[PDB]
């Protein structure tokens, strides 16, 4: 019954009030405690005062314009408060979003036109405010985005974002294209899909254009002015309501399709979005709005939301804020970038280095075989010109930054070297000892290795303080993580200059101390080995794939094993054997290596050879090799599916703890982001380190329940699941 959070017996004020001689109130949002407008306790009270004043002065108001005094329009909420919401705080969570929506609902049913002047990014709570208005104008300014990306933090649009979009575009279109994945749109795309009505050039002409639309709307459409389509007498929802015979025919197929795209992963946010969208389309707008709040409070108090907010907000900020950056060091600009090696990996490095406005000197052996590296850069730009994501001027200056060559003398000015020739430690030593003297003394000499330690390679250079390990993933154009491997000789400055380079090419950097397999390659090995171990124990191979997909992984393990050659796994299984057997230590082989060698003996090495755990024809994946069940006696061991899911998640989580114990990783934020974006650890966990503190099962929730379940797996599947002492007392 109130517009305010409290109603019994002191925050700042965010909104400025400007009424003109016409009677148009201009609500300019300007939060003095931060350079961005955000949905905190200050806004809710500030908008409460503004809406109450709109009603008490309605006899002298002709229309409302909502703008912002920041470079952005509005973005997000107070994440530091929402991550603390407990299940007994569901009443407070419910009342808060209900208060937020009653404000927008009064502003929406004011009887007067309300226009949103979107001067920049309008995300989450920002687009939800603009959706309550009757008209939306956005400036085609650079950096502006529009969308409802709450689902990427384990949440849903709870400020009317679900109720209004499903009511503007129908159930199917709103869920698929806007709600289910939180897709972010540029203003040109937003005006096409219907989120935005008009477009202007600069932000200077937004408020004048908004007032010009209010004046025209009152003249031409005097009755329907300030009336949303669903508040009219003859409103019909696009695609029909769940009562419509056309929609009710395909309506049962929506939850089944959601289980297909999520592969059965326990991600409850898209489930709640689809449920609030359909149940809301069955009732009136106000009852639909309240159903949206109850599903919203069900996610905020849940654990999966706390996992995602930890990884995709706090942990990702602490990394981009220069957490793993050495203290106090400044920047040294990267003039020319020498990318030694022009294979599949070498091409992607030069592309993302050229797409960042830096000059590249691609160098290889055959000018013919080194033209494929620039041909890969043109294969992407030609696809981008067709999609309209880049211009010919922007695409030619990019390829002009790339300077394909083969002369070692063309390095007079290069201060940054990445080697991605191929893998052989002795062969790496000699090829490195070539450009060291040709480049300037402040030139970094990187290397792309997956398992070979850096400190051993660093001996083949004089300036060992500048020998570093920059590990990219395939394909480099899309993979966002860059694993920077710190050797024993690498200095504080040489590491920081690589940390600054990663953020410049728009990627996520983590810093890792020198070790065998480092972090990404080492943890992903326990994931595939645990699955092949299950295959040898007699588990159905189809059950192994279903366990990997329902766990939340992007690719099932047996399928992933064929994508990274089984003989490549065997070679690493020997390099690690020689590694321990040279430090006076014996090597206990993983039970998966018997499966790897049994497949290699059978002549099924993976995808390149054309036969692995799957069969491959026409370049595509056909199905599981039918003789696989007979070879490993599949069906003899039938454990429950939840034990298979846990065996794969616990192996990676315990291996992450062994990395944090050995000083391989410095902070837990790098462990989460490294696992999520590097090897594909399921995002609902929030990272392989958050998975421990955020575990949840029949044994409870927290580190203690994780230890209990880890020991429960140890007594039934092996002592590799016993937890380290760092998780114990």
């Amino acid at each position: 019954s109130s517009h305010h959070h409290h109603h019994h017996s002191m925050p700042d004020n965010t909104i400025q009030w400007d009424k003109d001689a016409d009677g148009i109130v201009t609500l300019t949002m300007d939060d003095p405690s931060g350079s961005t407008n955000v949905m905190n306790e200050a806004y809710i009270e500030s908008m409460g005062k503004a809406v109450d004043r709109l009603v008490a002065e309605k006899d002298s108001i002709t229309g409302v314009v909502v703008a912002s005094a920041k470079k952005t329009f509005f973005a997000g909420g107070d994440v530091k408060t929402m991550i603390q919401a407990r299940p007994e705080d569901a009443g407070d969570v419910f009342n808060t979003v209900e208060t937020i929506k009653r404000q927008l609902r009064t502003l929406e049913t004011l009887g007067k036109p309300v226009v949103a002047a979107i001067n920049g990014a309008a995300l989450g709570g920002g687009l939800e405010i603009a959706l309550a208005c009757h008209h939306r104008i956005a400036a085609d300014v650079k950096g502006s985005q529009l969308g409802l990306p709450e689902v990427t933090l384990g949440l849903l649009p709870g400020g009317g974002g679900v109720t209004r979009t499903v009511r503007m575009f129908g159930i199917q279109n709103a869920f698929v294209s806007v709600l289910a994945q939180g897709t972010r749109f540029k203003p040109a795309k937003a005006k096409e899909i219907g989120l935005v009505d008009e477009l202007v050039a600069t932000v200077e002409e937004l408020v004048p254009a908004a007032k010009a639309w209010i004046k025209e709307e009152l003249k031409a459409n005097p009755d329907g002015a300030g009336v949303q389509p669903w508040d009219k007498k003859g409103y019909k929802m696009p695609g029909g309501t769940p009562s419509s015979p056309g929609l009710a025919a395909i309506l049962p197929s929506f939850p089944s399709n959601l289980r297909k795209q999520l592969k059965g992963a326990p991600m409850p946010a898209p489930r709640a979005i689809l449920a609030a969208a359909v149940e809301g389309a069955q009732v009136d707008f106000d009852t639909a709005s309240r159903i949206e709040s109850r599903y919203f409070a069900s996610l905020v108090t849940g654990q999966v939301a706390k996992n995602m907010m930890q990884a995709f907000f706090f942990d990702l900020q602490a990394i981009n804020a220069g957490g793993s950056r050495p203290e106090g060091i400044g920047k040294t600009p990267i003039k020319r970038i020498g990318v030694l090696g022009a294979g599949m990996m070498g091409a992607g490095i030069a592309y993302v280095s050229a797409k960042a406005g830096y000059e590249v000197v691609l160098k290889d052996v055959s000018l013919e075989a080194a033209a494929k590296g620039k041909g890969y850069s043109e294969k992407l730009e030609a696809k981008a010109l067709e999609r309209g994501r880049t211009t010919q001027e922007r695409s030619d200056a990019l390829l002009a930054r790339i300077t394909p060559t083969a002369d070692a003398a063309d390095f007079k000015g290069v201060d940054f070297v990445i080697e991605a020739v191929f893998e052989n430690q002795e062969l790496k030593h000699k090829v490195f000892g070539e450009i060291e003297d040709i480049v300037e003394p402040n030139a970094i000499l990187g290397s792309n290795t997956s398992t070979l330690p850096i400190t051993g390679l660093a001996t083949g250079v004089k300036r060992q303080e500048d020998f570093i390990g920059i590990h990219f993933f395939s394909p480099v154009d899309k993979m966002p993580l860059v694993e920077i491997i710190k050797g024993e000789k690498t200095s504080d400055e040489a590491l920081a200059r690589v940390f600054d380079y990663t953020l410049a090419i728009g990627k996520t950097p983590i810093v890792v101390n020198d070790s065998r397999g480092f972090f990404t390659s080492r943890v992903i090995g326990t994931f595939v080995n645990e699955a092949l171990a299950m295959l040898g124990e007699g588990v159905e191979p189809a059950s192994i794939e279903q366990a990997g997909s329902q766990a939340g992984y992007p690719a099932p393990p047996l399928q992933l094993s064929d994508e990274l050659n089984l003989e490549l796994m065997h070679k690493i299984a020997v390099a690690t054997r020689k590694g321990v057997e040279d430090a006076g230590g014996t090597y206990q082989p993983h039970p998966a290596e018997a499966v790897v060698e049994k497949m290699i003996e059978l002549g099924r090495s993976g995808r390149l050879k054309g036969a692995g755990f799957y069969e491959y024809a026409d370049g595509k994946r056909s199905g599981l090799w039918p003789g696989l069940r007979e070879t490993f006696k599949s069906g003899s061991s039938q454990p429950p599916l939840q034990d298979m899911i846990d065996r794969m998640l616990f192996a990676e989580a315990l291996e992450t703890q062994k990395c944090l114990d050995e000083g391989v990783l410095t902070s837990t934020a790098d462990a989460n982001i490294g696992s999520i974006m590097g090897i594909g650890f399921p995002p609902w966990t929030g990272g392989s380190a958050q998975f421990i503190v955020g575990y949840s099962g029949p044994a409870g929730t927290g580190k203690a329940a994780f230890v209990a379940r880890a020991r429960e797996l140890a007594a039934a599947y092996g002592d590799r699941f016993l937890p380290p002492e760092s998780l114990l007392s």
């Binding site: 769940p242 009710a248 395909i250 309506l251 049962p252 197929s253 929506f254 939850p255 089944s256 399709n257 959601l258 289980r259 297909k260 592969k263 059965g264 489930r271 689809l274 449920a275 969208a277 359909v278 149940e279 159905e540 191979p541 189809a542 059950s543 279903q546 366990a547 329902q550 199905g623 599981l624 069906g635 039938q638 599916l641």
Partner: protein
């Protein structure tokens, strides 16, 4: 307690879906036509003894809404004290109405009860009533909803029934249905549908394709709410050991969409002697069970064991078996699990040839086994039906 006998059991012919003869007939008249046929058989019957009319209807909506059993009582001029209740247990609605009528008589508080079903699927298609499991995502998501058509293909994939194995059964159902019609097995129970003038509308089950060949069945393309994405991947998320679903079911080996109705009179022995009626069969036992809702149609297997356990009988003591032919693989699995003899199963053909009028199929395949036990002079029969949502119902009768 009190024994419940079957005194009469009739049914209309089954008109096909596309260009059907019964499409112009309201589903209420399909029942009123059968009430008038019972009157013609027993004119001196005191209809005030009939204490209830229990009709099964899976889609009680529109033409079939508003308690069509009460509309049948009023429109047919029956005594206004004769009640009238509609129920819905999916495919077993026709059999559950009979079982409930037999259970009400066994409890003693009811003397003579009409029971049966009705479903005009050409006028009120399946799923026209909306549904909670379907048109609500939160429940559709948690219970892992999947249609019967997918679950039937999964039964064929798990049990190894090939496309030829299920199409060979559909041929057998077409032949036994054509051979039964020729011998006049149905001439007494199939009451032809007429209009208000007495003109003939339908006197035979027009869904039958008696000239079906093994070659013609092979050219049929598989029909797998299906053809909408999702349901294949949902079933494999629960049956994670199965890799791919072998879609073997077509329109030729699955039950037919038809219109029809059936009626079964049930009463105690005292109600029979007092009205001068000849008891034809005795309800020996009934049972309710079910199985996994994602495989759905494996409910008849524990429901048949539960009803043989109540009657203290075995598979040997049952002379005739009658399982509804919703899908060919469902009947084959039933034959394999219980080791049913081949010459005892659906001896007069099934729903693949004649059709599956949902809410009335239970009372049709029951009245078929009453006819056959008399014609063969056999002793016992067992009738069961698979159900959506993973349920199962079974009933044992004995000739008198």
């Amino acid at each position: 307690s009190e024994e419940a006998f079957i005194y009469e059991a009739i049914r209309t012919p089954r008109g096909k879906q596309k260009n059907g003869s019964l499409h112009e007939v309201k589903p209420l008249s399909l029942v009123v036509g059968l009430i008038d046929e019972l009157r013609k058989r027993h004119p001196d019957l005191d209809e005030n003894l009939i204490s209830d009319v229990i009709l099964g209807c899976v889609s009680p909506v529109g033409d079939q809404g508003g308690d069509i059993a009460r509309a049948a009582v009023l429109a047919s001029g029956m005594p206004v004290t004769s009640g009238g209740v509609q129920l819905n247990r999916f495919c077993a609605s026709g059999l559950e109405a009979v079982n409930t009528a037999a259970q009400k008589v066994r409890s003693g508080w009811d003397d003579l009860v009409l029971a049966g079903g009705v479903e005009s699927m050409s006028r009120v298609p399946m799923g026209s009533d909306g549904g909670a499991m379907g048109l609500d995502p939160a429940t559709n998501y948690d219970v892992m909803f999947v249609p019967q058509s997918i679950g039937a293909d999964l039964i064929a994939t798990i049990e190894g029934f090939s496309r030829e194995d299920v199409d060979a059964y559909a041929l057998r159902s077409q032949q036994k249905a054509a051979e039964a019609w020729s011998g006049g097995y149905f001439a007494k129970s199939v009451v032809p549908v007429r209009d208000q003038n007495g003109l003939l509308i339908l006197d035979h089950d027009e869904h039958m394709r008696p000239d079906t060949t093994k070659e013609g069945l092979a050219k049929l393309k598989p029909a797998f709410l299906a053809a909408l994405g999702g349901f294949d991947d949902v079933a494999l998320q629960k049956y994670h050991w199965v890799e791919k679903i072998n879609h073997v079911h077509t329109g030729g080996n699955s039950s037919g969409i038809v219109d029809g109705a059936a009626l079964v009179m049930i009463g105690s022995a005292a109600a029979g002697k007092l009205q001068g009626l000849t008891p034809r069969a005795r309800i020996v036992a009934t049972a309710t069970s079910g199985a996994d809702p994602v495989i759905m149609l494996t409910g008849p297997t524990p429901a048949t064991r539960k009803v043989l356990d109540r009657a203290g009988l075995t598979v040997d003591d049952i002379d005739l078996f009658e399982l509804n032919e919703a899908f060919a693989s469902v009947v084959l699995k039933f034959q394999k699990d219980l080791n049913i003899p081949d010459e005892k199963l659906n001896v007069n053909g099934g729903a693949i040839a004649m059709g599956h009028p949902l809410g009335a199929t239970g009372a049709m395949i029951l009245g078929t086994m009453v006819d056959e036990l008399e014609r063969r002079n056999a002793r016992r029969a067992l009738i069961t039906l698979c159900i959506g949502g993973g349920m199962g119902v079974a009933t044992i009768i004995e000739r008198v």
